[PDB]
Design a protein around this ligand. Sequence first.
Ligand SMILES: *[C@@H]1O[C@H](CO[C@@]2(C)OC[C@@H](O)[C@H](O)[C@@H]2O)[C@@H](O[C@@H]2O[C@H](CO)[C@@H](O)[C@H](O)[C@H]2NC(C)=O)[C@H](O)[C@H]1NC(C)=O
Ligand SMILES: CCCCN[C@@H](Cc1c[nH]c2ccccc12)C(=O)NCC[C@H]1CCCN(Cc2ccccc2)CC1
Ligand SMILES: *[C@@H]1O[C@H](CO)[C@@H](O[C@@H]2O[C@H](CO)[C@@H](O)[C@H](O)[C@H]2NC(C)=O)[C@H](O)[C@H]1NC(C)=O
Ligand SMILES: *[C@@H]1O[C@H](CO[C@@H]2O[C@@H](C)[C@@H](O)[C@@H](O)[C@@H]2O)[C@@H](O)[C@H](O)[C@H]1NC(C)=O
Ligand SMILES: *[C@@H]1O[C@H](CO[C@@H]2O[C@@H](C)[C@@H](O)[C@@H](O)[C@@H]2O)[C@@H](O)[C@H](O)[C@H]1NC(C)=O
Ligand SMILES: *[C@@H]1O[C@H](CO)[C@@H](O)[C@H](O)[C@H]1NC(C)=O
Ligand SMILES: *[C@@H]1O[C@H](CO)[C@@H](O)[C@H](O)[C@H]1NC(C)=O
Ligand SMILES: [Cl-]
Length: 527
Amino acid sequence: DIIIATKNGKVRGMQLTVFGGTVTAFLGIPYAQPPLGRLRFKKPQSLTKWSDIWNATKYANSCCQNIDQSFPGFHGSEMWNPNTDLSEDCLYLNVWIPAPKPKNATVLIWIYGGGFQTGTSSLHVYDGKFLARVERVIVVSMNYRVGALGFLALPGNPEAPGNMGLFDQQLALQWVQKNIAAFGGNPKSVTLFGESAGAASVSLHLLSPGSHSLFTRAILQSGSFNAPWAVTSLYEARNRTLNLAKLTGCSRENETEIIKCLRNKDPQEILLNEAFVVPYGTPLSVNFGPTVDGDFLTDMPDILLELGQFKKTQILVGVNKDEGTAFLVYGAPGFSKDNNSIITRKEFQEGLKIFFPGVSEFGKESILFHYTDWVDDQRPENYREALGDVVGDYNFICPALEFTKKFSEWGNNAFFYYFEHRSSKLPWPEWMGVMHGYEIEFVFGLPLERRDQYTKAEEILSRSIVKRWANFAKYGNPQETQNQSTSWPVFKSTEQKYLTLNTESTRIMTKLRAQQCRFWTSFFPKV
Ligand SMILES: *[C@@H]1O[C@H](CO[C@@]2(C)OC[C@@H](O)[C@H](O)[C@@H]2O)[C@@H](O[C@@H]2O[C@H](CO)[C@@H](O)[C@H](O)[C@H]2NC(C)=O)[C@H](O)[C@H]1NC(C)=O
Ligand SMILES: CCCCN[C@@H](Cc1c[nH]c2ccccc12)C(=O)NCC[C@H]1CCCN(Cc2ccccc2)CC1
Ligand SMILES: *[C@@H]1O[C@H](CO)[C@@H](O[C@@H]2O[C@H](CO)[C@@H](O)[C@H](O)[C@H]2NC(C)=O)[C@H](O)[C@H]1NC(C)=O
Ligand SMILES: *[C@@H]1O[C@H](CO[C@@H]2O[C@@H](C)[C@@H](O)[C@@H](O)[C@@H]2O)[C@@H](O)[C@H](O)[C@H]1NC(C)=O
Ligand SMILES: *[C@@H]1O[C@H](CO[C@@H]2O[C@@H](C)[C@@H](O)[C@@H](O)[C@@H]2O)[C@@H](O)[C@H](O)[C@H]1NC(C)=O
Ligand SMILES: *[C@@H]1O[C@H](CO)[C@@H](O)[C@H](O)[C@H]1NC(C)=O
Ligand SMILES: *[C@@H]1O[C@H](CO)[C@@H](O)[C@H](O)[C@H]1NC(C)=O
Ligand SMILES: [Cl-]
């Protein structure tokens, strides 16, 4: 009933009833020629004009990916698996615009995480219709190729240059540039936001010169490119794809002939060998991920960060209180989502070997040293809580803090939050705490659905969070001005102030996990 004319053709949307109002969803618009046939592994190719009206009325195909199978029938895990047909034909995106059509609204662009191996924009917790409704921003999300099909790399070779998933992202950003005006959006006020691997994607779009002109601002949720899992080395990248070449019988001398050999293999056989390529995998392993390809990424990101080579603008950055616990039940011994996983000193030690496999015996002892100095002896949760902190502090909280320090050191406004509210609809047990990934729903305004059994404190917090994100998007400043909400101070290198987000106190604190992270960011990286 509502048709928006785009630069490639007409598209018919769909009308949703949201909170006594209306949002217009355009679900499943393609933003690239499908990366099939000879196009597999190659950069996303431009999409040529269509003559008809494309029907963007259902989510499109999710890109190929392995599914999480460790808890069949358990919502806490299955809520993250694709809710849409897998297919190599998956370069599509979604647009939620407020009804009535705005004049030119801030656009929020969501980039999902999932280790760069999994994920889809279709997910229930990435629904932008609440944001379009409640704050009159336009929400855009895109599907981008993951795992090997998105990030397999023989650096140099254009048949598989690496970073194709990032280029998918970027070409969707280009689409919002050429097209969001027709939807009533302002291409000049575009805020990227994403979570974990999506957050690290957003941070890399700050470094990549071809994205500098495609967005204004950046929100980084539980992830940043300087995290240990974010970049696979050029050594690792090559050893990873050769392992894949052996395991599919495509081992050749000629590099390009390897590639087209892996191009007549089917998505299923490629998907199934991807898991075995990681020499010693961990719950945190990125089988096939971002590389310094020389195209999207011209140098090693930690040097671009260290010497100020990034887009100058405001960042909103933050992490959750128990980032690390989700991964503990994917391999660590003595752990379980179904009991309270009290572990002993020897199970903890065995857990370090599982999360730090190729790390020195003395390196692992150093982790044990800094994290086993209890305030007190007999508290049996000590080892269980410690291994969660170790994995959280090392993988998320401290790369994020370090990213924000170094990024603020170049004069730009930065805001750090510490999300510490555990969802009352949280399917995982309570020892797991304020888990990785479970701020997302608050950011998207789901607790504003009074029908969805969230408590009223939750609805309030999500409303405040949603106002802070929209104000950051619109005005570069994540305050809630109207109600008497705590002012959110900018994060500066000396004082390192951050805002805590929760049901009760919105309090201002300083120097989060400071002692833990002098360890990780300045002693451990040497072992
Ligand atoms: C918490 O649970 C783990 C694992 O197990 C449970 C809940 O899930 C898997 C089932 O097959 C088990 O029967 C059990 O219901 C316990 O860890 C196990 O401990 C055993 C000693 O009793 C060892 O022989 C096993 O190797 C070990 N298995 C794993 C996967 O860790 C753990 O002891 C439980 N802890 C508490 C405090 O209940
Ligand atoms: C040889 C072994 C390969 C392991 N390959 C990883 C890929 C990966 C997924 N995620 C990750 C988050 C950080 C780092 C890496 C990854 C893997 O499969 N690890 C299993 C544990 C995660 C499964 C996904 C579901 N959980 C919730 C969640 C949260 C945020 C975004 C999406 C999903 C997270 C635990
Ligand atoms: C939408 O908002 C933007 C402001 O963000 C307006 O963009 C202006 O575009 C003209 C075009 O020549 C420029 O000269 C102005 O400098 C822009 N404004 C700013 C503040 O930079 C735009 O006019 C608005 N209205 C629309 C698109 O209808
Ligand atoms: C695209 O969609 C067109 C519209 O179908 C109808 O649209 C509105 C008015 C609702 O009543 C909806 O339930 C209907 O399905 C179709 O007529 C057209 O054939 C479609 N074209 C393609 C290529 O899918
Ligand atoms: C890929 O690498 C596997 C492990 O190699 C060992 O560990 C790495 C981290 C380096 O220290 C390296 O020098 C070691 O040899 C090998 O087992 C495997 O054969 C390699 N695969 C290919 C195709 O080369
Ligand atoms: C590999 O085969 C391709 C065939 O397209 C050829 O162009 C290339 O020269 C070969 N590799 C080398 C190193 O010559
Ligand atoms: C501010 O207070 C009003 C009082 O009714 C409340 O409804 C609203 O959700 C609060 N938050 C805002 C406007 O961000
Ligand atoms: Cl929806």
